[PDB]
Design a protein around this ligand. Structure first.
Ligand SMILES: CN1C(=O)c2[nH]c(N3CCC[C@H](N)C3)[n+](Cc3ccccc3C#N)c2C1=O
Lengths: 730, 730
């Protein structure tokens, strides 16, 4: 008879388990249990201690993470983790010799390492420190410095600069070991002409003069960082003081002007795959390069060029998808839009072929989310094909030799509980673990790839289940409304004993940025849960135009004009919800973070009358303020010769007036390096000039996620009270 | 039957007039009328056009101000005024030749001047541009560069650096022409070792990358700017390319360590008076320097040293009071604390006298506010002696030759309407205009100094009076409560038909910093007027310990320990008010700006339970954050060898916990160069860590005054709504 308290949320009272394993081979995997690394035999529960509760305590309680070498002979022990941006961070490392049973102490690894990683084979290491790349052929042996041009905020070697870490690659890493580890490829970035943004940092109240953090950040239209690609021969290191890395230069069709390095992928050990993108992500090229033994050089013949294009918008979802080559690297499968605009899988040949470079192996009004594994006979992927639910996820598999032999492997399993799967196949797809994130409580089970026999259940949240028993949890409808003759999905977090006859207050939850999906079949316990279980508020999300995985017609609809259709559709959806009866029209709100904050602001400032209040957290206020890679992908260049007009027309401050008819709460982090505060400061200024009262809240020294424990709790408490005041609850 | 709306305040509906004249001689004065400068004859209303409605319009509507040379031959026309700090600003100038009837156009004055001023005599001009001093013997003639060491944020010649402008002198100017204008003395400051503070400036939403403003600002304990005094011979200029200024060096008892230049005052044209203060304002020395014709050097013999001390606190109110020498500069009168701790006037001799340097000309438990004029037979001064009202201001006059012949010249006049006078005597005290700021509507009248005969009434706010007739204006009690057997004055802005039997909500208004006075007999039309007239809120102020002009016992009581007695006494006063009956104890609030924000915060966080809510605008949260000259004057150095403990003990963030029992609104300007935002940012962070919800509001690009039209209106509207919500009104 208890509800789900804001406190339950904030204090993480009801913990949701999972089973994050690490395949060490085609049949064994590692798993952390009570701070013990255990080696398990997929097949028979046969388990075994790999690393002890012990070991980790040597470096006390600061042991941030661990990395076992592929040959399972050593273990990287991470500690002194200091974050910096979304994925970047510096840490200290120790190499524990499993065999000799002790921490290697000789040629230690620098105490401020920016990035480290084993080879794909033995125990080779490559790490970046002070922006320079170093290599250790073996843990006991000394470092061999690979680059020396490294310099803070200027030259990045083997690590990404800010915009590259955030918008191109999903990480800080810009290193790629080859199979067999002969070569080590790496990217170099020059942030020279890139402008600087400089926010303040107050730190402890004991610091008398606040600090200034500067970051080379390219805002829409500004000069971007430049790239260069290199591959250095790792074997020679012992016979030289210095080795000379060979450089690969980007394809001709990309060098005429600004461009980006898209993706790196080793095919074999004498072949590497590189994807390049023009600054206007209209065009993209994937070059396949071969190593020349004779002239000791890498060649990227235009014959193996492969071009990807889009006359509707940009390439890929957030960039060209990644290639998956066969064993002999003669062919590769890659996800690309088909003639109808649906992201599907098609075969390619090393050599390009005059307007027939592809052969689609998938058709349909649905999309392949990702290619999970490629065997000598099978291609395992994940799609939202089943039951026509774009917000659902299932694991499929196609036999190469017979494309008709296509079978879903998760569809039967638990149709009720599981409609959103995550997969994880062993080194050669002999086994595969399934992660049911599905409607019901998450469920983890591993199967034998051959026949799909569910060997056992790794984790079923029974523990959580027994607890949620004494609690009145909300439900979640995931259906679709239909506009202009098209399906547009949405979801609702309905408070407990939801009575379709009564009238509840509505809270729209937004993102709605390009290729986003807020309406899906995944289980969650967030603030929306509390809002429904305790405040009896209906929290709904609506994937409109420019959204999710439903074809380019829907996703590209927003091209060159953000702050348009995706905002409208969001309002339209609220109307549609109202027509559904159980919504108290006099109590409808809308909130959002980042892009969601932008839309929230654009909606509240539309003077549509439909909304009473709204909260925008670290919103974007006009696109010239945001970075280049992201913004330009959808907006082009903010020049008069391109799209300056849509940039200036899609401003938040231009709608200040319409804010008089709305209660608004603007929140923003002081040390936000992604969305610069300048954006909110500009909004607030517009509102003050317009003579519009509103509420604001800054978070001292907080990130773009305002996720530090105390700040996190405070911001949701402050937002909860705002709604209670606005919905006349509390 | 109409109330005083918030709109009345914000739109300055009811304008209050005054009579700001400019004595051009001992019998005539200048006055601006409908943008026409008129010359009036004190005696007979005899008037006459000096400068027309015309002239000013040549420089359009950007004519910021005007300065008439003392020999009334030329007029300085200021325009293109661009503010910078409290008093600094740069403008463009034009010299209008009254006689030749047109704007001088030859050797024009640089388009970005930082400061200009006429000599005391003819038409000599001195101006600073690009941090360097220039002189023009006459308006048509060419500039003569006096310094060339000038450099932005490093070397200041003839103008004050940040701290000096804000805390030592009350302006930007550091130039001093001598009588007869032979010499030009100036100060030079080196901001070299002074640390930098760097806030962000966003500007129009069109600016893609925010700017950064850096200012050499010395926070408590930091390295301070250095000083140097020069006097240059203005007569030689035409016979050289460069003149060499002679330098005066501070007195020996001040040079051992950090010190400051206090005050400059020309005695005759061969004698100058300088005051110096040690960094620890415990000690001060006033040297009288004489010009040596033979060796062409200035001499400041220790025989004419004159020491000022304080074993209770610091020197003077905000620094040593200014000397006023006799015609032959043989003696001078200066306000200093007598044996009882009361600021009074006493006589001095050019030469110091072994512990008898002073002869007090005034006695009493009241203080002399200022020395207005010194005639060959009379000394006119302003005090709060009358009716024992420290919060009152009256013009007195003593006969040098006879210290008994002491007479008040304003006490009688309008005892009902006037209790707060401002004065303004002609070049030789033949006439004197009075500024009744008194209880009633401000009244301006001029008098023939001889017999006090009121020649006429210059301005009586009848226009205003006629208007306020149709409005329900609040009242204002100015009385005193008594604590620990001492009088402590307070004031109350009682709402219209205030009925002593009913119960109203209370709003404490605060500054309460060293030597402040919030309780006085001066008429005002502010936000407090609105609050009482329309919201029915009793706005009250209380001058507790560490306050006003009631002797050093009361003012120094706070020494070395701010955030103590002055905070408590404020709470005490609230209690006392409640005991007066007509206060609704369940609705007591307290707000303040600057130091007041600090106290407001220190009170709200005291957990005394006495207050419900409060507002702090640009508060100080811990003294290490504020500037040196101000902080140190009362707190000493933030070092373990001095007062570090009290600095650390008087923090606002240290009381975060107690804020859970209070609604708090923290407001702060983004471009605040006085109180750095770092201060509010540090407070918000403390409350977030403490798990205390509160309200905040930042003002983009706003000053420490948040005085820009739209901001000013927005901030008061926002605070009004805060109180309305808090007092359950609205
Ligand atoms: C709510 N929200 C959200 O969860 C998410 N993830 C992303 N991106 C995903 C691809 C990598 C990229 N770095 C971030 N965005 C895009 C975005 C748009 C406008 C402003 C800021 C951001 C940022 N962040 C957003 C959101 O708006």
């Amino acid at each position: 008879r208890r509800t789900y308290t804001l406190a339950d949320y904030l204090k993480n009272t009801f913990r949701v388990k999972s089973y994050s394993l690490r395949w060490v081979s085609d049949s064994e995997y590692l798993y952390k249990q009570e701070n013990n690394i255990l080696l398990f035999n997929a097949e028979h529960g046969n388990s075994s201690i790999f690393l002890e509760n012990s070991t980790f305590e040597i470096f006390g309680d600061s042991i941030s993470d661990y990395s076992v070498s592929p040959d399972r002979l050593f273990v990287l022990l991470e500690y002194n983790y200091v974050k910096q941006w979304r994925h970047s961070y510096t840490a200290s490392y120790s190499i524990y010799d499993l065999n000799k049973r002790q921490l290697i102490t000789e040629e230690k690894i620098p105490n401020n390492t920016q990035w480290i990683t084993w080879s794909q084979e033995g125990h080779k290491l490559a790490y970046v420190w002070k922006n320079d790349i170093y290599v250790k052929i073996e843990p006991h042996l000394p470092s061999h410095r690979i680059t020396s041009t490294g310099k803070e905020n200027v030259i990045f070697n083997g690590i990404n600069d800010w915009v590259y870490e955030e918008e191109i690659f999903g990480a800080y890493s810009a290193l790629w070991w080859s199979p067999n580890g002969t070569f080590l490829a790496y990217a170099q970035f020059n942030d020279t002409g890139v402008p600087l943004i400089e926010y303040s940092f107050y730190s402890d109240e004991s610091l008398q003069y606040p600090k200034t953090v500067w970051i080379p950040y390219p805002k829409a239209g500004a000069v971007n960082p430049t790239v260069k690609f290199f591959i250095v021969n790792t074997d020679s290191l012992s016979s030289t003081t210095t080795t000379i890395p060979m450089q690969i230069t980007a394809p001709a069709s990309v060098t005429t002007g600004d461009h980006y390095l898209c993706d790196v992928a080793w095919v074999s050990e004498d072949r590497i795959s590189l994807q390049w993108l023009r600054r206007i992500q209209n065009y993209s090229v994937m070059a396949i390069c071969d190593y020349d033994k004779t002239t000791l050089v890498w060649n990227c013949p235009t014959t193996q060029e492969h071009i990807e294009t889009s006359a509707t918008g940009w390439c890929g979802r957030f960039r060209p998808a990644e290639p998956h080559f066969t064993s002999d690297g003669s062919s590769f499968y890659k996800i690309v839009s088909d003639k109808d605009g649906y992201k599907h899988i098609c075969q390619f040949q090393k050599d390009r072929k005059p307007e027939q470079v592809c052969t689609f192996i998938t058709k349909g009004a649905w999309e392949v989310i990702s290619i999970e594994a490629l065997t000598s006979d099978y291609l395992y992927y994940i799609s939202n094909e089943y039951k026509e639910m774009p917000g659902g996820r299932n694991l499929y598999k196609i036999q190469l030799t017979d494309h008709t032999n296509k079978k879903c492997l998760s569809c039967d399993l638990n149709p009720e509980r599981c409609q959103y799967y995550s997969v994880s196949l062993s080194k050669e797809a002999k086994y595969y673990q399934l992660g049911c994130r599905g409607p019901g409580l998450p469920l983890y089970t591993l199967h034998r790839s051959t026949d799909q026999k569910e060997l056992r259940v790794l984790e079923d949240n029974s523990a959580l289940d027994k607890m949620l028993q004494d609690v009145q949890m909300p439900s979640k409808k995931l259906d679709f409304i239909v506009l202009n003759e098209t399906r547009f999905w949405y979801q609702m977090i309905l408070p407990p004993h939801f009575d379709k006859s009564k009238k509840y207050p509505l809270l729209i939850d937004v993102y709605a940025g390009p290729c986003s999906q807020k309406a899906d079949a995944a289980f969650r316990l967030n603030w929306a849960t509390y809002l429904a279980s305790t405040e009896n508020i209906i929290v709904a999300s609506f994937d409109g135009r420019g959204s999710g995985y439903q074809g380019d017609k829907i996703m590209h609809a927003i091209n060159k004009r953000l702050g348009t259709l995706e905002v409208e559709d969001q309002i339209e959806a609220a109307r549609q919800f109202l027509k559904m009866g159980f919504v108290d029209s006099k109590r409808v709100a809308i909130w959002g973070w980042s892009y969601g904050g932008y839309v929230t602001s654009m909606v509240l400032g539309s003077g549509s009358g439909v909304f009473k209040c709204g909260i925008a957290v670290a919103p974007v206020s006009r696109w010239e303020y945001y970075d280049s890679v992201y913004t330009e992908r959808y907006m082009g260049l903010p020049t008069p010769e391109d799209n300056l007009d849509h940039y200036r027309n899609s401003t938040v401050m231009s709608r200040a007036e319409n804010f008089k008819q709305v209660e608004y709460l603007l929140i923003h982090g002081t040390a936000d390096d992604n969305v610069h505060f300048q954006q909110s400061a500009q909004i607030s200024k517009a509102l003050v000039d317009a003579g519009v009262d509103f509420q604001a809240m800054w978070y001292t020294d907080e990130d773009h996620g305002i996720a530090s424990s105390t700040a996190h709790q405070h911001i949701y408490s402050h937002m909860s009270h705002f709604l209670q005041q606005c919905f006349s609850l509390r």
